[PDB]
Design an enzyme around this catalytic site. Sequence first.
Site, PDB file in Angstrom:
ATOM      1  N   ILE A 195      81.374  57.396  49.079  1.00 20.60           N
ATOM      2  CA  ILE A 195      81.013  57.118  50.463  1.00 20.60           C
ATOM      3  C   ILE A 195      82.219  57.148  51.389  1.00 20.60           C
ATOM      4  CG2 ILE A 195      78.904  55.808  49.996  1.00 20.60           C
ATOM      5  CD1 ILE A 195      80.530  53.229  50.177  1.00 20.60           C
TER       6      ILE A 195
ATOM      7  N   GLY B  64      89.814  56.038  51.752  1.00 23.38           N
ATOM      8  CA  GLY B  64      90.640  55.252  52.650  1.00 23.38           C
ATOM      9  C   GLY B  64      92.116  55.584  52.563  1.00 23.38           C
TER      10      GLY B  64
ATOM     11  N   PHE C  15      94.234  54.094  50.713  1.00 19.57           N
ATOM     12  CA  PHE C  15      94.548  54.087  49.287  1.00 19.57           C
ATOM     13  C   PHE C  15      93.292  54.045  48.420  1.00 19.57           C
ATOM     14  CE2 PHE C  15      98.165  52.136  51.505  1.00 19.57           C
ATOM     15  CZ  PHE C  15      99.187  52.971  51.082  1.00 19.57           C
TER      16      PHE C  15
ATOM     17  N   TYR D  47      79.236  46.077  50.942  1.00 24.50           N
ATOM     18  CA  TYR D  47      78.662  47.351  51.354  1.00 24.50           C
ATOM     19  C   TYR D  47      77.893  47.190  52.647  1.00 24.50           C
ATOM     20  CZ  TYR D  47      75.595  51.456  51.392  1.00 24.50           C
ATOM     21  OH  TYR D  47      74.932  52.615  51.735  1.00 24.50           O
TER      22      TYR D  47
ATOM     23  N   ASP E  77      95.079  50.107  61.607  1.00 24.05           N
ATOM     24  CA  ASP E  77      94.361  51.372  61.469  1.00 24.05           C
ATOM     25  C   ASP E  77      92.974  51.311  62.119  1.00 24.05           C
ATOM     26  OD1 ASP E  77      94.142  54.045  60.730  1.00 24.05           O
ATOM     27  OD2 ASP E  77      93.590  53.619  58.646  1.00 24.05           O
TER      28      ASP E  77
END
Length: 290
Positions: A22, A25, A27, A93, A136
């Site tokens: 999904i 990122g 990392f 999630y 970020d």
Amino acid sequence: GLPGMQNLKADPEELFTKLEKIGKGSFGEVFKGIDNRTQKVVAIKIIDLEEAEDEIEDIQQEITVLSQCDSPYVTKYYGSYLKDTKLWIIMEYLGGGSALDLLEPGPLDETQIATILREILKGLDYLHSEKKIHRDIKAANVLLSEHGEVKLADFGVAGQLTDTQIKRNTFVGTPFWMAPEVIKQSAYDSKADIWSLGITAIELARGEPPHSELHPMKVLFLIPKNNPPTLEGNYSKPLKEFVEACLNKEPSFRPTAKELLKHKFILRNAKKTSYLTELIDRYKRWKAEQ
Ligand SMILES: COCCOc1ccc2c(c1)ncn2-c1ccc2cccc(N3CCC(N)CC3)c2n1
């Protein structure tokens, strides 16, 4: 020591059903997963430690930051497991999609923009009060629940202020959204997030950040040297002023997150988050495309 590390006898391939990818990122890759004990859906980041070279500390730092957050506006962290050489990192999630995903069927209206920005601001206010900096902020890292709740994600480069280090100097973030003082590696703090929020506001209104057509390396001079971006096009003056307030070259001239929660653009346009389900439905029906 890794916060939330579970018993190493526990087999995550047993305890969780791993489903589709999904995201990716700062990392590691993220997968949809099912908790086989509760049947709740989770997000699972999986890391091959045998590969990871310099990123284990980063991976650990991200988990540490998440474990220290307890907010309706920040993705929850549940725990971590090991399967042979792979680390399974179990997190909240959110099934509505990222704000960027929800942009694919077409533009947002200003009510949707204001509502999403308001909720982002609630998350930033929380973080900054905990002396954390996300670093970020962008639409891809803003996730919605299937009910329209809005939460911040990917703390892979998040920063922590302490009584010892009042500021940070690290070059981290996603170039188009990075504040000029971060790019220059001047001393910076939570105001860096307020700049990124202004860029995200442009992104929510137009679909892309400023300079999106250029090679990212060009922003190394463009952002520090140029006048800040403005929102161009047929948008309300309060939205344009919201963007301008965030995108000031001088960090002390940017409002705090707390202050922006009372900005006229937000108060005049934001509505109940539950209304954002219309945006999620729109995306579901749209991706019903062959
Ligand atoms: C088409 O939308 C399907 C839903 O997509 C996602 C995508 C990521 C999700 C999620 C739902 N529910 C929780 N997450 C998490 C949960 C923990 C994370 C830790 C690090 C990085 C993440 N993402 C954030 C979104 C970005 N676009 C990519 C990296 C994480 N994402």
